[PDB]
Amino acid sequence: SLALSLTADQMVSALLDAEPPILYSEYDPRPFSEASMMGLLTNLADRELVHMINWAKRVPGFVDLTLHDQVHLLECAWLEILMIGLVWRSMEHPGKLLFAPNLLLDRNQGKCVEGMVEIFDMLLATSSRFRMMNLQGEEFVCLKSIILLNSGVYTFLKSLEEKDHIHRVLDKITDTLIHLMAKAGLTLQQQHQRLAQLLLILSHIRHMSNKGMEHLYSMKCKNVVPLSDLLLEMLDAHRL
Amino acid sequence: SLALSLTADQMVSALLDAEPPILYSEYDPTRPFSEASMMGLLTNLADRELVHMINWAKRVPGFVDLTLHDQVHLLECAWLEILMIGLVWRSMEHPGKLLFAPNLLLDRNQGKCVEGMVEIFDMLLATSSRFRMMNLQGEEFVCLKSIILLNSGVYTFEEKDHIHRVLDKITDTLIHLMAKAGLTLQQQHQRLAQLLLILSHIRHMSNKGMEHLYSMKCKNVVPLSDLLLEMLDAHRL
Amino acid sequence: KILHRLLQDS
Amino acid sequence: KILHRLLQD
Numbered sequence: 001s002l003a004l005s006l007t008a009d010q011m012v013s014a015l016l017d018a019e020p021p022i023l024y025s026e027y028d029p030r031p032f033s034e035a036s037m038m039g040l041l042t043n044l045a046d047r048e049l050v051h052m053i054n055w056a057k058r059v060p061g062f063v064d065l066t067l068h069d070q071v072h073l074l075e076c077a078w079l080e081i082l083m084i085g086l087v088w089r090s091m092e093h094p095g096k097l098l099f100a101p102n103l104l105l106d107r108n109q110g111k112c113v114e115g116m117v118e119i120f121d122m123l124l125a126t127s128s129r130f131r132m133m134n135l136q137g138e139e140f141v142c143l144k145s146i147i148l149l150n151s152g153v154y155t156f157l158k159s160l161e162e163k164d165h166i167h168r169v170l171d172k173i174t175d176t177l178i179h180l181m182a183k184a185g186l187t188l189q190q191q192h193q194r195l196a197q198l199l200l201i202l203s204h205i206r207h208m209s210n211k212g213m214e215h216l217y218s219m220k221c222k223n224v225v226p227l228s229d230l231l232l233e234m235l236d237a238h239r240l
Numbered sequence: 241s242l243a244l245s246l247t248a249d250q251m252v253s254a255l256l257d258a259e260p261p262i263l264y265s266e267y268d269p270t271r272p273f274s275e276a277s278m279m280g281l282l283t284n285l286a287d288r289e290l291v292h293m294i295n296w297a298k299r300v301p302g303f304v305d306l307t308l309h310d311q312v313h314l315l316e317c318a319w320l321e322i323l324m325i326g327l328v329w330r331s332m333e334h335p336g337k338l339l340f341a342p343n344l345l346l347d348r349n350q351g352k353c354v355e356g357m358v359e360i361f362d363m364l365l366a367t368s369s370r371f372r373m374m375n376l377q378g379e380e381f382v383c384l385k386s387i388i389l390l391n392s393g394v395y396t397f398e399e400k401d402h403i404h405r406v407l408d409k410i411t412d413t414l415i416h417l418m419a420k421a422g423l424t425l426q427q428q429h430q431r432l433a434q435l436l437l438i439l440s441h442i443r444h445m446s447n448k449g450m451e452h453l454y455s456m457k458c459k460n461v462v463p464l465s466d467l468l469l470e471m472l473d474a475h476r477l
Numbered sequence: 478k479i480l481h482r483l484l485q486d487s
Numbered sequence: 488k489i490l491h492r493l494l495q496d
């Protein structure tokens with residue numbers, strides 16, 4: 001009831017200021033074991049989850065939703081949001097994943113954990129794609145907010161009031177993306193093409209999350225890593 | 241490439257012409273549904289559709305310009321997505337029901353017959369309601385289905401640059417269609433976004449469907465055709 | 478759920 | 488592969 005009043009510049013400003021902090025890892029740069037690396041990654045993810053929730057409530061229109069629907073959106077999208085963040089900060093590091101400023105991992109270190117190098121390859125490919133497109137920070141925060149609102153909306157009485165509100169905010173972010181591109185001097189045809197290019201990447205990000213959810217579940221059942229209660233509940237929501 | 245020299249109207253016509261037919265199911269009304277028989281019907285149908293999909297893909301502008309290895313990869317990656325968006329499309333005018341075939345129209349309660357399938361049905365039905373709420377047009381649908389074919393597996397790979405040029409053409413085509421339909425400039429990029437974001441849900445349904453199909457196979461519920469076994473194996477679950 | 482508590486506590 | 492074979496003529 002207020003996010004609709006935001007201008008394109010104000011949407012960007014609100015999103016930029018809502019950005020979560022970049023966290024460090026406990027990593028003592030002692031060599032990796034398989035359990036060691038999974039520990040670092042999951043510990044990091046768990047701490048990031050806490051900040052993600054603060055961020056989500058600062059995403060324009062999110063607090064207007066019921067507490068139930070906020071839970072559903074975050075449960076659905078949390079790994080997607082973690083991954084696009086990872087991919088974004090890894091953009092200027094070709095062939096490397098910047099989980100934290102003190103935890104920069106190349107592809108072959110994905111092999112430390114069974115079945116993780118396939119996940120790394122997908123993440124790196126996405127980062128390479130962002131780098132190819134020269135993805136801007138302002139575009140990035142728009143994309144991440146889109147993921148939060150869109151990923152779980154299809155799996156939702158006056159429930160339509162929530163859905164229509166979410167879609168109305170989604171259109172606003174689309175307007176914001178286009179605004180950024182027009183401001184960058186892109187022609188009308190180039191704006192529509194770039195918009196499409198950015199959104200189709202979200203299809204691959206969804207794919208990576210689904211794959212990552214399965215991998216994380218497999219590592220869980222084997223108990224190579226003790227997952228936090230919060231992380232376990234987020235994983236449980238996808239009921240694999 | 242001749243695909244890039246195609247106009248928007250030429251893109252639409254080619255895609256509409258390449259549209260595969262609506263096949264029938266082996267549905268036998270003389271016997272009640274079992275988990276096995278229903279899975280048998282659906283996988284039998286998917287198998288026959290796959291043959292049509294392969295030949296359809298070869299008629300998608302720019303696709304045959306790719307190596308056989310890249311064609312294989314794209315189809316292996318997107319085949320279930322493509323089956324699902326087709327199902328969702330022909331289910332549009334049937335609220336609460338999925339039209340797998342003209343003789344196989346199923347609701348969510350019939351999905352309960354197979355363990356864990358009603359969850360898939362619900363997602364498919366929700367997508368169908370979304371397309372119906374958006375009043376998705378046939379011309380838009382064939383653009384979306386072709387986008388899925390080219391895009392879904394492109395990030396798992398210049399061959400990549402050729403694919404992106406074609407994808408841009410389809411974007412131009414979608415915009416062209418919306419403008420021709422009278423949508424304002426703002427409405428155009430808004431609708432474009434709405435349509436493409438649904439592809440994220442379709443990708444999601446595919447991943448879930450792949451795991452469910454794999455689950456049925458590994459419990460010997462249903463014998464999958466050699467083609468289906470290969471398409472499924474490509475995802476390495 | 479923990480997510481419930483976190484969303485209420487800001 | 489069947490798919491590879493089917494993608495030919």
Ligand SMILES: C[C@]12CC=C(c3cc(F)c(O)cc3F)C[C@H]1CC[C@@H]2O
Nearest residue numbers: 041044045082083086212213215216
């Ligand atoms: C350890 C995994 C790989 C990366 C993960 C991961 C962790 C993070 F902190 C982060 O900011 C992003 C991530 F993508 C979590 C798991 C998902 C699938 C793998 O199990």
Ligand SMILES: C[C@]12CC=C(c3cc(F)c(O)cc3F)C[C@H]1CC[C@@H]2O
Nearest residue numbers: 282285286323324327449450452453
């Ligand atoms: C049998 C499944 C449900 C529907 C499927 C399916 C079959 C088709 F012919 C079709 O045109 C569309 C489909 F979506 C295939 C499997 C994916 C997940 C389930 O196992």
